[PDB]
């Protein structure tokens, strides 16, 4: 799989993950991408393949839930522990990597497997340089998102401009006020048959 | 607090540029005959 | 119009109803933290003002 | 009473147009941003401190805990096309409740 | 603290007495028309 | 820096209140 | 490294059975005849070196002893974890429905 | 979907015999459950003791078994702890403690059966929601 | 004259740049104190144990807040409704820990704002005006009483008063929705009709009067120079305005009487806001918004959700997360 | 009853889960109800001694009637909806209850408030009418026109 | 005698009982009888905290602190077995009571020091050969100091031990290593030490009173930072009975 194709399958490049005051390049958030870690396959003790539920764009944070190929829940990272049934420790969850830097490696230490599962909600997993830019870890939008924002806002504001100047054009004669001796008959009811036409007087 | 380093200059210009614009216009209105 | 056009679908537009609109408010708090937004804050000042 | 007052009736009535019209227009600009999820969701400095310092709490960090509750508890029924199943054990909850 | 308390009790009493005596001092008469 | 900035803006607003009240353009009936 | 001791416990038999040394008392409701009378006695007389030691609690009726015998296969013992037994947490661990 | 005779067929006793309740019985059971029980058992939970619910499977593991009409009716006359070891009429409403739980004073035998039947039928309608608490609202 | 008489004439003088008055003698010191304490607290107060669980919340700028996150934090739940002046504390340090500034601020503010309202009656009497501007002000005032005093009384604690800050206000709002379903309460709904409608009629009136200004100025001057303070003649043509709006809708939907119009402009927001104040002051005693949770049921008895059920799910998320270390028992009864 | 030592049970915050001290030392119930420690009622007073709730009495002397009363009152707390659905706002339909205390408190706050408004309306009106300007300002004797300018 | 309504709000509920200056007696111990402390009460009058200097040059000293959590500091209604050992010393083994209080005190300059002021699981013993308890009897022993917060407690970002998130969810792609101490919550359990010096005995009633000093660690915030060493001084009261 080309690294470029895998990189598109990562939520940190989704333009709907940003913030209005999270300024700068996307590299300032998750870091400067260095390499694909490879494709993570999760398995329980029985060896069944498990799939991390991916984060939809709407969610700033998202829990870690692993299902089998038919969508049945098989493992998760619990919040309350006392009645946990699906923890990675109870289900003996492991992760093996295929392709990329971690190709051919398998991890069984539960904190490590959990860390990789937390990245898997974002899609394919990458290694990033977070030091060069002092990246903060928080997602930013791309030029697609910024362009789109500025153009939609400006278009809406130019609607007001259209209305304002159209109005000024068509009502130029009353720009400083209405006729001081405007006929009460023109604005009262009953007098003209057609509104604003003195030749239609009763 | 690890605030953004441009926050100070941004806030300062945001206040000063339009404020000075208004002050310029006000003073030259008072100095008219 | 614009809001749902930016999102996945019309589904996430406001539905035309009293309770439905309340739901739209509470979604905006939970997902967008919309109370924190200074463009909303200026709206509140213009309406209460 | 208040220290200032209107003295010009034309200014008064213009201001009455200006205030609520301008406010609604500002709110529309924010929702154009939200179309794109371009939110004022966070204060980064707050997050850095709170992450490193588990005794640092503000009303901002409190409200985020509420938002996290709203998303987890509402999403399965509010977004039925997502087929979310959130086992009881993953739901965010404080003590007792 | 005991001194702060006494000081504030005296301050408050003073302004309250101004309010009460002030309003007893011919208040209906302090208007621009009928008195 | 941030605290000084927020306090400075506030202080300017309080000063503006004082001038807008006591150094207003007097309303003139004539 | 730093380790979450509750999570680690979930990878022992504490994650598979009622651990007579740690598990909160409400877990005894899973099997017939254990709650509240025996559960109270079990938690009160813990810790146990082995599961069979539960049969040495004084004053038990014959029927009580047999109910315990019938349920030994659902019990386990692990080392006492301070985080699970402080705060009266074995009697009320802050979880309701 | 419908509230059919099958939905309304529940166990009468521990020996496997069933009873098919009428629709009038179902409605009476809901009404009477509201009257006398819902203040603590709304939705199949127990507000004053959340560890014990009214799920059918919980009831089956009670002593004596409470997953049948006879077990429930007996519970309403002479309530016990979950292990059967202690009689709790003094702090749980029953016919035996109708002097101190006055809402129980005009409950007839027929009323008990109706309430028992509500308890057994409701989970067949609502599933996990019955006894689930707020998570399933 | 004698000193008392002179003082009284000065207190009540119609010629002071700002009116003092007898309401003013209480208003001035109480608002100054609330203001000064508020400013200092907002800048420099240390963290406050609002929920009484030894988990102090930082409100002030110097302790890591900005303008949007900052607040003066309500007094400790351990205090409840107990009066906690400075002289009840063993030291200023304790007083700060337990949220003493909140109580000093809100009590002096409600007293001072109440006198502000009286001072409005008072000056109107001295100027020979009609007396009811103070009645319009009773609407926002009532609202302030509701969130700073009546809600605490009902719930048994000043820790449930609205915080004196931007993000604290949002926190109060979200918890209130969780606990009361305020959005489904008709008095809050009256409030929204009051403020949305006040805004609407504000823009409508501004626009109609502005539409009909009498031409008195050239194209190179603001039309506002066409009105001179104190002129006797009206500056717009109300008959032209009514001619316009009556055609926009229909004739009898428009006002041609300025007195009737202006009374309506007063009444509509004041009344709606009186209702919303009363929403908060009655939810204070836990009479809450409508609950249609599981109201719609199918032929078998399956629950058919409505948009009310989806609100419920959101409310649940707020409920289970709020004050996450403060509840030990399963119901939040206050 | 399950075996807890309620005196020594530390809750999550470090304060006692069941029992704690008021700010003046008295023994009181814990959790959010710390705010309500001034409460006094006949089902509870037998447990109270000169230092507040008495742990010996709690451990040995709680009668079934006190358990019953407490369970009754816990389950009829004065919370409910305007359509009379008892309980917290997230409660499901089932229990038709709003406390008489809520109906009586709310109604009377509403009435007291509007009566304050009526007091201001009529007091302001009475003052103006006694002085002769309740129907408006006399155009030819407008008092403000005889006052000096403020500035 | 005083009722609840005489005491309520005065401060006296946080004070241990005292004995008169005439209480200089001797309470006999019969080595064949079994005994208990029916009530032990501990009222702190001073909290001191050991300064942590930058250089180990000097011995760090214990400095005064200001109490900010009000009159909520006393331990009371504590009880347990008072054993007579073969050598005639007594050993108190604490079973139950109001045997902890969270307390926060403030150093000069404002740093807040929360601590779980406690005698949990106290095992304390006198000198040998205590044929009578008198004004020369002393107890010395050790006790357990569990974590100030218990395992459910959630930090302001929602992270905890037995509940809560296990990462810094606001920084979704930050490196986790640097945040490991704040993210991975730990439950402290350490030992404290106490001495009880009897100053007063009523031989007739079995009541004793005196002064105490204890030493223990403060809150470590579930492992996020190093605790401070605290010294508590106060008065005590105990009621001894046959049992
Ligand atoms: C919308 C239209 C808008 C029109 C504009 C003009 C506005 C006027 C208001 C119109 C409302 C008409 C609805 C009439 C139906 C109704 O009410 O129906 C309700 C009842 C009749 O219905 C019965 O209502 C009962 C209400 O429960 C009550 O009874 C229960 C069963 O015994 C329990 O005891 C429970 O605890 C108790 O609250 C039960 O639900 C019954 O099943 C049901 O049959 O009418 C009653 O009660 C009589 C009502 C008496 C007035 C109440 C005064 C006190 C209110 C406090 C005021 C301050 C706060 C107000 C905030 C808003
Ligand atoms: C349509 C115009 C537009 C767009 C889409 C972009 C897009 C981008 N620029 Mg360019 N840029 C622009 C114009 C634009 N730029 C202009 C005009 C300049 C000269 C100032 C620049 C100079 C510039 C620099 C120097 C940099 C960028 C960078 C970027 C990137 C990050 C943007 C960011 O963080 O925004 C943040 C956006 C906001 C914080 C929102 C601002 C909203 C304002 C404050 C609202 C004010 C409201 C007002 C006061 C209210 C009035 C109310 C009244 C009526 C009542 C992104 C690809 C950065 C980089 O990545 O480059 C490699 C970078 O370093 N840009
Ligand atoms: C609220 C919207 C609105 C309003 C009130 C105005 C008002 C005005 N327009 Mg603008 N205008 C608008 C929107 C609006 N316009 C839009 C969206 C455009 C397209 C870019 C324009 C383009 C425009 C131009 C180019 C001009 C005006 C001018 C004017 C002025 C004279 C009236 C006129 O020409 O009406 C125009 C009529 C309409 C806006 C009504 C269009 C109704 C359409 C045809 C219905 C079509 C149905 C559709 C096919 C159904 C399918 C939907 C699909 C999704 C399935 C007046 C100031 C003139 C000018 O100012 O004069 C000095 C002028 O030259 N208008
Ligand atoms: C003090 C509290 C307060 C106040 C004053 C406001 C005020 C506002 N809010 Mg905010 N809000 C709040 C709190 C508040 N909000 C909180 C705590 C939240 C949770 C996050 C929200 C969540 C929220 C959302 C999610 C939205 C708002 C929006 C708004 C704006 C609505 C403008 C309007 O009138 O739309 C009303 C609608 C219109 C004006 C459209 C035109 C309507 C036509 C003219 C109607 C014609 C009707 C016709 C005649 C038929 C009638 C038939 C009849 C039978 C019904 C306004 C600035 C909205 C916004 O920002 O918009 C850009 C918005 O989407 N708010
Ligand atoms: C202090 C007055 C008061 C109080 C506390 C109660 C309390 C109660 N009533 Mg009684 N009742 C009253 C007066 C009161 N009522 C009056 C005046 C009548 C004659 C109409 C009744 C007739 C009555 C009947 C026939 C029944 C009750 C029932 C009940 C119970 C349920 C109420 C309910 O569901 O309300 C629902 C809530 C409403 C209908 C909304 C009321 C909102 C109003 C309109 C707000 C008004 C605001 C303000 C005054 C307007 C000013 C405008 C401003 C511009 C100045 C409850 C215990 C029921 C029951 O349980 O009896 C045993 C029952 O069946 N009541
Ligand atoms: C220590 C520190 C730092 C403390 C600070 C802490 C803190 C939390 C500070 C708050 C920060 C703050 C202010 C935030 C608000 C920010 C915010 C959202 C701003 C909105 C900005 C904005 C551009 C919004 C767009 C919408 C808009 C234009 C709103 C304007 C609202 C507005 C000003 C309305 C008018 C309000 C008002 C009081 C008017 C009085 C008019 C008046 C004198 C009437 C009297 C009158 C009536 C008559 O009829 C007649 C005839 C006469 C003659 C007459 O006189
Ligand atoms: C293709 C085909 C078929 C084409 C055919 C088209 C055709 C020719 C049709 C003809 C047939 C026909 C008409 C069919 C009708 C179909 C139909 C019923 C459409 C309905 C649309 C509809 C229901 C719209 C909504 C109704 C609506 C606008 C309601 C408004 C109600 C409302 C609240 C009005 C406000 C009234 C009010 C109290 C106002 C006071 C507040 C205010 C304005 C204050 C300010 C103010 C007021 C003044 O008053 C003046 C003076 C001044 C100074 C001033 O400040
Ligand atoms: C005379 C001119 C001077 C007057 C203006 C003074 C500044 C005013 C304040 C503007 C602040 C905006 C930037 C926020 C602060 C900041 O630090 O940003 C700083 C960012 C730069 O971002 C920086 O980038 C760095 C490496 O490039 C690092 O990543 C830094 O971390 C990052 O801060 O500035 C911009 O990107 C500015 C361009 C903005 C593009 C706007 C597109 C959206 C248009 C919106 C339309 C809105 C209209 C609403 C109208 C009603
Ligand atoms: C008891 C004493 C109480 C005193 C309290 C202090 C009052 C402060 C009043 C505002 C003074 C500043 C006004 C400057 C502006 C000023 O000088 O205006 C004076 C101006 C006078 O109007 P005229 O009709 O005389 O103007 C003629 C026009 O034709 C000029 O073109 O008044 C208005 O426009 C009223 C509408 C704006 C009212 C704005 C109110 C703002 C409230 C404050 C909001 C911000 C708070 C921030 C908190 C941090
Ligand atoms: C007219 C009124 C104007 C008021 C101006 C007041 C300034 C003069 C007094 C300075 C006092 C502030 O002193 C304050 O003390 C504590 C130490 O316990 C510090 O400790 C604090 O550090 C950080 C700073 O971001 C906070 O986020 C945090 O909640 C807190 O622990 C503060 O950072 C320090 O600034
Ligand atoms: C437990 C540690 C196992 C590795 C974690 C998942 S992958 C890890 O993700 C980090 C956060 O982005 C990146 O910055 C970094 O580049 C990467 O090494
Ligand atoms: C003009 C009002 C002065 C405001 C006084 C601020 C509090 S006094 C302040 O308190 C801090 C925390 O204890 C100390 O760190 C600091 O040394 C001290 O200067
Ligand atoms: O404090 Mn503030 O919020 Ca009124 O409920 Mn209960 O308390 Mn707490 O929880 Mn929910
Ligand atoms: Ca870094
Ligand atoms: Ca001695
Ligand atoms: Cl909260
Ligand atoms: Cl609680």
PDB file of C-alpha atoms in Angstrom, chain A residues 15-16 18-22 53 56-62 65 73 76-80 84-87 136 138 140-141 145-146 148-149 152-153 156 160, chain D residues 10 21 25-26 28-29 32-33 36-42 44 47-48 68 71 75 79 82-97:
ATOM      1  CA  UNK A  15     -10.783  19.413   7.036  1.00  0.00           C
ATOM      2  CA  UNK A  16     -13.695  19.124   9.396  1.00  0.00           C
ATOM      3  CA  UNK A  18     -10.264  21.945  13.101  1.00  0.00           C
ATOM      4  CA  UNK A  19     -11.028  24.988  15.327  1.00  0.00           C
ATOM      5  CA  UNK A  20     -11.627  28.667  14.541  1.00  0.00           C
ATOM      6  CA  UNK A  21      -8.748  29.847  16.754  1.00  0.00           C
ATOM      7  CA  UNK A  22      -6.457  26.829  16.191  1.00  0.00           C
ATOM      8  CA  UNK A  53     -14.709   1.847  15.771  1.00  0.00           C
ATOM      9  CA  UNK A  56     -16.687  10.500  13.111  1.00  0.00           C
ATOM     10  CA  UNK A  57     -15.817  14.161  12.378  1.00  0.00           C
ATOM     11  CA  UNK A  58     -18.483  15.507  14.733  1.00  0.00           C
ATOM     12  CA  UNK A  59     -16.654  14.234  17.869  1.00  0.00           C
ATOM     13  CA  UNK A  60     -13.794  16.039  19.603  1.00  0.00           C
ATOM     14  CA  UNK A  61     -13.283  12.937  21.740  1.00  0.00           C
ATOM     15  CA  UNK A  62     -14.457   9.368  21.262  1.00  0.00           C
ATOM     16  CA  UNK A  65     -14.706   0.148  21.171  1.00  0.00           C
ATOM     17  CA  UNK A  73     -18.744  -5.593  20.592  1.00  0.00           C
ATOM     18  CA  UNK A  76     -13.340  -1.711  24.938  1.00  0.00           C
ATOM     19  CA  UNK A  77     -11.540   0.757  27.200  1.00  0.00           C
ATOM     20  CA  UNK A  78     -13.871   1.154  30.137  1.00  0.00           C
ATOM     21  CA  UNK A  79     -14.537   4.383  32.031  1.00  0.00           C
ATOM     22  CA  UNK A  80     -15.999   2.765  35.238  1.00  0.00           C
ATOM     23  CA  UNK A  84     -16.038  -3.957  33.288  1.00  0.00           C
ATOM     24  CA  UNK A  85     -16.616  -7.045  31.057  1.00  0.00           C
ATOM     25  CA  UNK A  86     -14.740  -6.086  27.846  1.00  0.00           C
ATOM     26  CA  UNK A  87     -11.410  -4.671  28.938  1.00  0.00           C
ATOM     27  CA  UNK A 136       0.323  20.775  20.641  1.00  0.00           C
ATOM     28  CA  UNK A 138      -4.789  19.254  18.674  1.00  0.00           C
ATOM     29  CA  UNK A 140      -6.309  21.931  12.682  1.00  0.00           C
ATOM     30  CA  UNK A 141      -8.049  22.337   9.330  1.00  0.00           C
ATOM     31  CA  UNK A 145     -11.408  24.369   5.303  1.00  0.00           C
ATOM     32  CA  UNK A 146      -9.976  27.886   5.648  1.00  0.00           C
ATOM     33  CA  UNK A 148     -14.268  27.485   2.424  1.00  0.00           C
ATOM     34  CA  UNK A 149     -14.870  29.382   5.682  1.00  0.00           C
ATOM     35  CA  UNK A 152     -18.856  31.464   2.736  1.00  0.00           C
ATOM     36  CA  UNK A 153     -18.579  34.284   5.303  1.00  0.00           C
ATOM     37  CA  UNK A 156     -22.989  36.115   3.126  1.00  0.00           C
ATOM     38  CA  UNK A 160     -25.940  42.668   2.762  1.00  0.00           C
TER      39      UNK A 160
ATOM     40  CA  UNK D  10     -32.920  60.026  14.846  1.00  0.00           C
ATOM     41  CA  UNK D  21     -29.776  43.396  13.256  1.00  0.00           C
ATOM     42  CA  UNK D  25     -25.677  38.869  11.541  1.00  0.00           C
ATOM     43  CA  UNK D  26     -22.789  38.011  13.940  1.00  0.00           C
ATOM     44  CA  UNK D  28     -24.942  33.769  11.350  1.00  0.00           C
ATOM     45  CA  UNK D  29     -21.215  34.140  10.802  1.00  0.00           C
ATOM     46  CA  UNK D  32     -21.090  29.367   8.874  1.00  0.00           C
ATOM     47  CA  UNK D  33     -17.983  28.362  10.879  1.00  0.00           C
ATOM     48  CA  UNK D  36     -17.279  23.219   8.870  1.00  0.00           C
ATOM     49  CA  UNK D  37     -16.804  22.212  12.535  1.00  0.00           C
ATOM     50  CA  UNK D  38     -14.627  25.283  12.725  1.00  0.00           C
ATOM     51  CA  UNK D  39     -15.626  25.835  16.393  1.00  0.00           C
ATOM     52  CA  UNK D  40     -14.456  27.925  19.371  1.00  0.00           C
ATOM     53  CA  UNK D  41     -14.304  24.615  21.204  1.00  0.00           C
ATOM     54  CA  UNK D  42     -11.173  25.022  23.302  1.00  0.00           C
ATOM     55  CA  UNK D  44      -5.305  25.552  24.131  1.00  0.00           C
ATOM     56  CA  UNK D  47      -5.784  22.339  28.053  1.00  0.00           C
ATOM     57  CA  UNK D  48      -1.992  22.282  28.377  1.00  0.00           C
ATOM     58  CA  UNK D  68     -18.526  14.882  26.850  1.00  0.00           C
ATOM     59  CA  UNK D  71     -22.156  13.493  23.226  1.00  0.00           C
ATOM     60  CA  UNK D  75     -25.326  10.152  20.074  1.00  0.00           C
ATOM     61  CA  UNK D  79     -27.516   9.582  15.189  1.00  0.00           C
ATOM     62  CA  UNK D  82     -24.065   5.477  12.974  1.00  0.00           C
ATOM     63  CA  UNK D  83     -25.310   2.187  14.621  1.00  0.00           C
ATOM     64  CA  UNK D  84     -23.496   3.176  17.800  1.00  0.00           C
ATOM     65  CA  UNK D  85     -23.442   0.621  20.626  1.00  0.00           C
ATOM     66  CA  UNK D  86     -21.697   2.093  23.679  1.00  0.00           C
ATOM     67  CA  UNK D  87     -21.410  -0.584  26.406  1.00  0.00           C
ATOM     68  CA  UNK D  88     -22.455   0.666  29.841  1.00  0.00           C
ATOM     69  CA  UNK D  89     -18.778   0.450  30.952  1.00  0.00           C
ATOM     70  CA  UNK D  90     -17.528   3.053  28.489  1.00  0.00           C
ATOM     71  CA  UNK D  91     -20.139   5.739  29.264  1.00  0.00           C
ATOM     72  CA  UNK D  92     -18.621   8.813  31.049  1.00  0.00           C
ATOM     73  CA  UNK D  93     -20.248   9.294  34.508  1.00  0.00           C
ATOM     74  CA  UNK D  94     -19.281  10.895  37.766  1.00  0.00           C
ATOM     75  CA  UNK D  95     -19.734   9.174  41.108  1.00  0.00           C
ATOM     76  CA  UNK D  96     -23.128   7.610  41.936  1.00  0.00           C
ATOM     77  CA  UNK D  97     -25.178   9.219  39.179  1.00  0.00           C
TER      78      UNK D  97
END
